[PDB]
Amino acid sequence: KQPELDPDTPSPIFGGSTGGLLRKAQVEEFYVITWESPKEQIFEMPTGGAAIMRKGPNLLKFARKEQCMALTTQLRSKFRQTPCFYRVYADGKVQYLHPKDGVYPEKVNAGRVGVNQNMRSIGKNVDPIKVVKFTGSEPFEI
Amino acid sequence: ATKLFPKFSQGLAQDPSTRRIWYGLATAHDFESHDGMTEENLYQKIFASHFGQLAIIFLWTSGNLFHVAWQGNFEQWVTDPIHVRPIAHAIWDPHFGQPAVEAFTRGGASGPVNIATSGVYQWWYTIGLRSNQELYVSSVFLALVSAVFLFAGWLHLQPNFQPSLSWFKDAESRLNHHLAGLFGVSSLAWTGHLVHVAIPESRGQHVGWDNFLSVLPHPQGLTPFWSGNWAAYAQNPDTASHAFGTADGSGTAILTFLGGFHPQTQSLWLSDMAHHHLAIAVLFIVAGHMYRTNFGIGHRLEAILEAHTPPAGGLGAGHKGLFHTVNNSLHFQLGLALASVGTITSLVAQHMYSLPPYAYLAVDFTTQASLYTHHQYIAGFIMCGAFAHGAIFFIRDYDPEQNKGNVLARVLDHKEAIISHLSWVSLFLGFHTLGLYVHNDVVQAFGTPEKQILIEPVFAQWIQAAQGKSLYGFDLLLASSSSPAYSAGQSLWLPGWLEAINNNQNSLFLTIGPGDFLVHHAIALGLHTTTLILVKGALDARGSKLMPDKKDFGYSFPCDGPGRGGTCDISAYDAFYLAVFWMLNTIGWVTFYWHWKHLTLWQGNVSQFDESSTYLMGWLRDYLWLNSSQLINGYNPFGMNSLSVWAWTFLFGHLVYATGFMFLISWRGYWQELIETLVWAHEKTPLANLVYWKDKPVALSIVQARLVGLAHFSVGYIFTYAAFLIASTAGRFG
Amino acid sequence: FTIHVTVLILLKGVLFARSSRLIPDKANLGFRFPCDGPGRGGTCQVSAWDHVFLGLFWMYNSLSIVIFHFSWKMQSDVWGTVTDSGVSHITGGNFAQSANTINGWLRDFLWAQSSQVIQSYGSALSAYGLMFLGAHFVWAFSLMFLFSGRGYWQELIESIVWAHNKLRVAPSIQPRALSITQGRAVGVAHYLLGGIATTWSFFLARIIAVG
Amino acid sequence: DIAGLTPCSESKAYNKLERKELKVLDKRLKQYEPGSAPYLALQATKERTENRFKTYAKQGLLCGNDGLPHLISDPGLALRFNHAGEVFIPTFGFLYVAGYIGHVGRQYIILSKEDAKPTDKEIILDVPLALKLAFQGWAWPLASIQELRNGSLLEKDENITVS
Amino acid sequence: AHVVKIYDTCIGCTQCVRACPLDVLEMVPWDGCKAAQMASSPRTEDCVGCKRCETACPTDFLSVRVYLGNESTRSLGLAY
Amino acid sequence: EIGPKRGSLVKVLRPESYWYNQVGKVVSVDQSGIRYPVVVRFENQNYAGVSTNNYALDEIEEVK
Numbered sequence A: 001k002q003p004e005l006d007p008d009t010p011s012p013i014f015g016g017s018t019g020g021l022l023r024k025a026q027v028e029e030f031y032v033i034t035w036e037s038p039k040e041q042i043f044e045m046p047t048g049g050a051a052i053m054r055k056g057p058n059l060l061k062f063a064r065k066e067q068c069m070a071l072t073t074q075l076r077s078k079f080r081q082t083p084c085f086y087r088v089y090a091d092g093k094v095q096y097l098h099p100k101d102g103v104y105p106e107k108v109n110a111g112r113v114g115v116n117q118n119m120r121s122i123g124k125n126v127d128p129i130k131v132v133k134f135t136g137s138e139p140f141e142i
Numbered sequence B: 001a002t003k004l005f006p007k008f009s010q011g012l013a014q015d016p017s018t019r020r021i022w023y024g025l026a027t028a029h030d031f032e033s034h035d036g037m038t039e040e041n042l043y044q045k046i047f048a049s050h051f052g053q054l055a056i057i058f059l060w061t062s063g064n065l066f067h068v069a070w071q072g073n074f075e076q077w078v079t080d081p082i083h084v085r086p087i088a089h090a091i092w093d094p095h096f097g098q099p100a101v102e103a104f105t106r107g108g109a110s111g112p113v114n115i116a117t118s119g120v121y122q123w124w125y126t127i128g129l130r131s132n133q134e135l136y137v138s139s140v141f142l143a144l145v146s147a148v149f150l151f152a153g154w155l156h157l158q159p160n161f162q163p164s165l166s167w168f169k170d171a172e173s174r175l176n177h178h179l180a181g182l183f184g185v186s187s188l189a190w191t192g193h194l195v196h197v198a199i200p201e202s203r204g205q206h207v208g209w210d211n212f213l214s215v216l217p218h219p220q221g222l223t224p225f226w227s228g229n230w231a232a233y234a235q236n237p238d239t240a241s242h243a244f245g246t247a248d249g250s251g252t253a254i255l256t257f258l259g260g261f262h263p264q265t266q267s268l269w270l271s272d273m274a275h276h277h278l279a280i281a282v283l284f285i286v287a288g289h290m291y292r293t294n295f296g297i298g299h300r301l302e303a304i305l306e307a308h309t310p311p312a313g314g315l316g317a318g319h320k321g322l323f324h325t326v327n328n329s330l331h332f333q334l335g336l337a338l339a340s341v342g343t344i345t346s347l348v349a350q351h352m353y354s355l356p357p358y359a360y361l362a363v364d365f366t367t368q369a370s371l372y373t374h375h376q377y378i379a380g381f382i383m384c385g386a387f388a389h390g391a392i393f394f395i396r397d398y399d400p401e402q403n404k405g406n407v408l409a410r411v412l413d414h415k416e417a418i419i420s421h422l423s424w425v426s427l428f429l430g431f432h433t434l435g436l437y438v439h440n441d442v443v444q445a446f447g448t449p450e451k452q453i454l455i456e457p458v459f460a461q462w463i464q465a466a467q468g469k470s471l472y473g474f475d476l477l478l479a480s481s482s483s484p485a486y487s488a489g490q491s492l493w494l495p496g497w498l499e500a501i502n503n504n505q506n507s508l509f510l511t512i513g514p515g516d517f518l519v520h521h522a523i524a525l526g527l528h529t530t531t532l533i534l535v536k537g538a539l540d541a542r543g544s545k546l547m548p549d550k551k552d553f554g555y556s557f558p559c560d561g562p563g564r565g566g567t568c569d570i571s572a573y574d575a576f577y578l579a580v581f582w583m584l585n586t587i588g589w590v591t592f593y594w595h596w597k598h599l600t601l602w603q604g605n606v607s608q609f610d611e612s613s614t615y616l617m618g619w620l621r622d623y624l625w626l627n628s629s630q631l632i633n634g635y636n637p638f639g640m641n642s643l644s645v646w647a648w649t650f651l652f653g654h655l656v657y658a659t660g661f662m663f664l665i666s667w668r669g670y671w672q673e674l675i676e677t678l679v680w681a682h683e684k685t686p687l688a689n690l691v692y693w694k695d696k697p698v699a700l701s702i703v704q705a706r707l708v709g710l711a712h713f714s715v716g717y718i719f720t721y722a723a724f725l726i727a728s729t730a731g732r733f734g
Numbered sequence C: 001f002t003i004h005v006t007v008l009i010l011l012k013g014v015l016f017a018r019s020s021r022l023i024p025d026k027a028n029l030g031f032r033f034p035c036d037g038p039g040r041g042g043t044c045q046v047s048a049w050d051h052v053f054l055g056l057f058w059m060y061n062s063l064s065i066v067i068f069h070f071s072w073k074m075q076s077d078v079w080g081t082v083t084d085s086g087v088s089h090i091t092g093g094n095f096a097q098s099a100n101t102i103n104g105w106l107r108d109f110l111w112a113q114s115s116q117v118i119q120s121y122g123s124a125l126s127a128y129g130l131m132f133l134g135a136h137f138v139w140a141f142s143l144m145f146l147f148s149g150r151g152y153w154q155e156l157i158e159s160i161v162w163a164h165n166k167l168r169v170a171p172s173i174q175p176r177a178l179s180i181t182q183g184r185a186v187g188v189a190h191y192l193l194g195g196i197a198t199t200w201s202f203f204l205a206r207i208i209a210v211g
Numbered sequence D: 001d002i003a004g005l006t007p008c009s010e011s012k013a014y015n016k017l018e019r020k021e022l023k024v025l026d027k028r029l030k031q032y033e034p035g036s037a038p039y040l041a042l043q044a045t046k047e048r049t050e051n052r053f054k055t056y057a058k059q060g061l062l063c064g065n066d067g068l069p070h071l072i073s074d075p076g077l078a079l080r081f082n083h084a085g086e087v088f089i090p091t092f093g094f095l096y097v098a099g100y101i102g103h104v105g106r107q108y109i110i111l112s113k114e115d116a117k118p119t120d121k122e123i124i125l126d127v128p129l130a131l132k133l134a135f136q137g138w139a140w141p142l143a144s145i146q147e148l149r150n151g152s153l154l155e156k157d158e159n160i161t162v163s
Numbered sequence E: 001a002h003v004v005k006i007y008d009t010c011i012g013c014t015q016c017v018r019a020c021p022l023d024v025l026e027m028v029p030w031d032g033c034k035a036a037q038m039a040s041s042p043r044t045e046d047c048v049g050c051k052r053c054e055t056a057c058p059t060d061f062l063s064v065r066v067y068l069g070n071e072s073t074r075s076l077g078l079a080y
Numbered sequence F: 001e002i003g004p005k006r007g008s009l010v011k012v013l014r015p016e017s018y019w020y021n022q023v024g025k026v027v028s029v030d031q032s033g034i035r036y037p038v039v040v041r042f043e044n045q046n047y048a049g050v051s052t053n054n055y056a057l058d059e060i061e062e063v064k
């Protein structure tokens, strides 16, 4: 069960910085991350300095998506902690992205069907002949 | 997704950034990668574009004629073309002070003016013109034809007038019409102009429109053309002491082939050019009848290329399937056209400083160099564009299925050998040229000029001796008398040629010293290196060993990522970038050589060149540091003069050059963070968060970055060299 | 101005090294890397190494301006020979109404004081002119590296390696072009070398013929 | 007489340049006593300068209107005259030395392609092998032509290309 | 956006995913030797085009190639 | 039993491959059955620094 975003979640103790949180975050979108973080500890922020983190699930949020994938990968690095992602649009609609499979896209989950791929040797593509349409960047099969 | 400017980009429209603005201002002329731009809807647009650009050209020439007629002193030039200098236009700039109005008043009949370096007075008076009204008429005519082309470009846009697609593929009839009509018929009309107006104007006769209805351009008028004996038109040419503004010893010959110079005007005989263009027109008319048409049999193209196949298989299929290849590709024709245009531009620049066609032109010493450098850089850019479109051909329009066995596939197959031999010739030239220059510099630094190396260019001197030169004494064709080449053509163009060739004061087969050897080899280095860069960018276009699938990312893409040990400037567009750098270098070396040759020649001290053109300290001292005192002294606390504007422009060129370096050295990524910082600062300024920018500010694209960098580079290079060539010449007169 | 711009470059390189607004995972990429990728419109010269790269150019500019100021002040308003009636300086006080214009630096200082460096072949100071021209040469040579990349050069090396393998004379070690970081390093090295060497030759050939 | 140039003895500019150089040398040669070191140095310099100017004018080398020597590089003009040494034999000498060098380097780089990790041999050379091959290449024209007729230098199109 | 493709030349090393900074591509069934995974691009609204996935892909020739397309707020990495 | 003998050196014919027309020994022709069974090993590095690669059996050919 992919968990959905929950407002009114406490935040880690930190002073402030000058990264992100601009006009884009108010009228376009903002991204959210949540993760366990037991054993209240010290961590580093991708757009700031060092901060403390209580035990129990805690939630953060930033401006760009990579600003949270960096934290997910960090959490991989040291102690096995398992955060998640969230999307937000102007209408308030929320979308869950990472990890949809729940098993961290680097590992397969029981079964799905992927797109944007073709069974052809590297190269051996089509010459610019018969490619006058050019459809932006061709999938070569659609 | 979000529609906005421009009208021909749906992917660049959703782009929330100022980048789309620059790509719209840039890709506005790329009428092939736009959305829904099939062929038959493209020829009509490109044809309207041809009309628009022709209208631009004619409006340019009309404005030139207008400012010559009203603001130029064309009347003050025709009478005594030696005591006066040209004028281009006036000035209403309020920023000038009182000394400035007194400094830009060379003429005296008006306020501030500017000298005319276009060389238009000479070319307009040689063809025959001695009144400003005759210039107003032509200016109005050119404006009218510009409007006509602006309308014709639009007429073929609405239906009932839109052409079809089969009308363009008929290359046979179009090439016939161009070889015969565009070249031959116009050349014959030009012969008529020279024989009916230019000649009468050379006789001081005021013959124009109101009187040519009964003027016989030749005694026994038009009868020899009916009753044979064409030779009757070349029996009384312009007398040696012929006056050009008057009839002091004139003649009645129209088709003359004495092949010499008009002593007073110092140019080709005004009557030689008539027979010249007449023969040219006849020969182009003969050429224009070669092809197959609806009812004209001739011989078609598909059966010729497929018949040029060496039986021994040295080429394979020969030229089979090239008709469908070329005729179905516009970039290949554009590459051929630009290559021919650049090579013939260089040819015309070579032929204008050696065979002056315009009366009273060679006496002027400022327009010559300006126009020569003009055409040299024009030809350089046109050649670089030819190679760029040659690479675009391989990138975008290519079908190796149809081309299995032709010469183009063979050329693509041994591309590594071509590139390697270009690299080798370049290495050879650079090594040896720089080595001889450094050797001469070190030898001069030790104070023993005798220990330097000076290769005697026996080959060019031999060819001159064959031309008629005798300063070298090789006893060759047109120099000895035991040869059929010297005997035959004795009453022909030979006397004038031989008299103008041995002259040691005109620019025609100059006395070549060993210092010309080194500079010709430097020019060969520059040409081979530029051609190396271009041929490499063109051949490694469909795919290289580092990037095999290069055909998928188009032509102008920044790079293929930092992977694989680094991939920077790998697209062919970047090779074109570097080849334009080398084009600037090569044309600059060529222009330095020509300029300093004619500068040592005009001071009567050609020995200065023959002695200082051997090393690099001379080029730096005797040419750059020396002939610039008026550039520095154009304005000073003592007081400025007419040469102040040219000095300020000489500094403007260096500023543009340094801005080019700004965009070249520093790359994009650095500036993205700074722009984000400036955005942070701009959004937080108190009470300064009112109506926002309409598009997001980001750093210029890497492709855009290097494009604008090279643009600044080229434009600053050009402005600096032109300001120098104009100021250091039209300020001292020596 | 020049010193503040140089400090700007250096400090913006130092601070944006652990983290930034664009790429948060910037510390793992190290200190000496050319970029991250052509994504987000293009990333070039983002590492602190590249900021030091640009700070070298700005330090060159600032120190050159300061040393030219020193030389021309000392030669115009300080140094000279004293006669019975006052002191007659080297230059006729050309510092007053020439420094106020960029052309002045080329009017009475660069153009005027460059006679010896290009006129010293007749004496024991010809080596100064030789170093002068050689430094110009190496400067433009550095420009070569600074304005080019590796793709073109790597493919040219490819064709040259083709030419080699036809006679079986290629090396066992794979001949690759210089790294992007090394390309920029060679660029800046030759650039500062040419600049400093030309200015050295000038200031050292001009000051011997006036003392 | 070739190319309007005159033998370099009859050049008034050449002798004027020699006199100029000698005057410029003597004006600062007169600054020192005949016993000191700088004086002997200037004496020897003048010696080999006079030797420069004397030894050049033998077997004929053309000087132009500038009085300086000008090398003739065309075979055929160096023949039918006495100029074969200006640049005709130096060409063959450099060709010989460059052959020598390339032959030795190629045979080295080939004989190293057989052992394990040849890359090491390119950063840690085989000094005795290089010395042996260095003293065996002065017959390379013989070995090159017959190794060409042999075919042991043409690779039978087994290399990496892209096209 | 950026048209990303994955050819049949692949071994399923799971490296171009633990290297992608934006978690764009997935790895779902493939019939391999020891790992048996193949990469796929189900979503591209967040792909910036950094070509970090092309550096870690050890396949010769590369299994993934980013066809550079049009830019957006995500594709330009704009926090504003 | 499917591909060439292990330890036997063979060349490459992948048009888009860094290693082209030059020889390289086979690590292990995949007998389990796959479209790229032959794993060839090369001593010299590539632009990426990789030494080995797997190719199809319709591409490799015999020795020099």
Ligand code: CLA
Binding pocket: B307, B308, B309, B310, B311, B313, B314, B315, B318
């Ligand atoms: C004496 C017998 C003879 C000879 C000598 C030739 C010779 C030739 N024939 Mg011909 N032919 C013959 C009999 C003969 N033919 C007969 C009996 C018939 C039937 C009637 C034909 C029918 C025929 C046809 C239909 C055609 C020819 C063509 C040609 C020319 C191209 C052949 C070729 O392989 O190019 C050589 C191939 C090369 C790759 C040469 C490479 C050139 C290098 C790369 C240039 C280097 C560039 C470099 C920068 C410049 C530096 C210069 C340096 C060397 C100093 C060639 C000069 C063809 C032609 O005219 O040209 C298209 C062609 O169309 N022949």
Ligand code: CLA
Binding pocket: B422, B423, B424, B425, B426, B427, B428, B429, B430, B431, B434, B525, B529, B532, B533, B578, B579, B581, C137, C138, C139, C140, C141, C142, C143, C144, C145, C146, C147, C148, C156
């Ligand atoms: C003055 C600056 C400069 C110099 C010297 C060069 C020199 C060269 N460029 Mg280049 N170029 C430049 C600026 C410069 N470029 C710039 C600004 C650009 C645009 C950014 C380009 C873009 C460009 C391109 C695209 C290409 C070149 C190429 C070449 C090479 C052609 C080789 C040749 O023709 O024979 C030899 C040329 C020489 C300069 C050799 C002289 C060097 C001597 C031997 C130094 C010897 C030093 C001494 C022995 C010991 C010193 C070492 C140590 C002790 C310090 C050549 C080495 C082409 C190439 O690579 O050739 C295949 C190539 O295609 N250039």
Ligand SMILES: CC1=C(/C=C/C(C)=C\C=C\C(C)=C\C=C\C=C(C)\C=C\C=C(C)\C=C\C2=C(C)CCCC2(C)C)C(C)(C)CCC1
Binding pocket: B331, B332, B333, B335, B336, B339, B340, B343, B386, B387, B388, B389, B390, B391, B393, B538
């Ligand atoms: C990139 C590319 C391209 C382009 C190309 C080019 C650019 C080319 C060119 C070229 C050129 C630019 C050429 C030129 C040339 C030259 C020639 C061809 C010559 C000759 C010879 C002769 C035969 C002569 C003779 C004579 C006479 C007649 C008399 C006097 C003497 C003399 C010698 C002068 C294309 C698109 C196509 C394709 C793709 C790729």
Ligand SMILES: CC1=C(C/C=C(\C)CCC[C@H](C)CCC[C@H](C)CCCC(C)C)C(=O)c2ccccc2C1=O
Binding pocket: B662, B663, B664, B666, B667, B668, B669, B671, B698, B699, B700, B701, B702, B705
């Ligand atoms: C300063 C700088 C910037 C930033 C420069 C900026 C943001 C200025 C460009 C936009 C401003 C508004 C230019 C102002 C107007 C121009 C002087 C001319 C515009 C005229 C057009 C309308 C034709 C880059 O983006 C860059 C990118 C890649 C390599 C080097 C650099 C670089 O050096």
Ligand SMILES: CC1=C(C/C=C(\C)CCC[C@H](C)CCC[C@H](C)CCCC(C)C)C(=O)c2ccccc2C1=O
Binding pocket: C144, C145, C146, C148, C149, C150, C153, C177, C178, C179, C180, C182, C183, C184
């Ligand atoms: C030419 C060039 C190269 C190629 C640089 C090369 C090939 C340097 C190699 C030259 C060295 C000096 C080779 C010398 C090694 C000799 C084979 C052995 C030394 C000689 C002994 C006697 C010591 C780049 O790598 C580059 C990178 C980024 C931007 C521009 C460029 C650039 O312009």
Ligand code: SF4
Binding pocket: E006, E009, E010, E011, E012, E013, E014, E015, E016, E017, E037, E038, E039, E056, E057, E058, E059, E063, E064
């Ligand atoms: S990195 Fe390349 S080889 Fe590895 S799993 Fe991804 S696509 Fe396949």
Ligand SMILES: C[As](C)(=O)[O-]
Binding pocket: B482, B483, B484, B487, B488
């Ligand atoms: C052609 As003859 C004058 O040598 O007989």
Ligand SMILES: [Ca+2]
Binding pocket: B500, B501, B502, B503, B504, B505, B506, B507, B508, B509, B510, B511
């Ligand atoms: Ca002459």
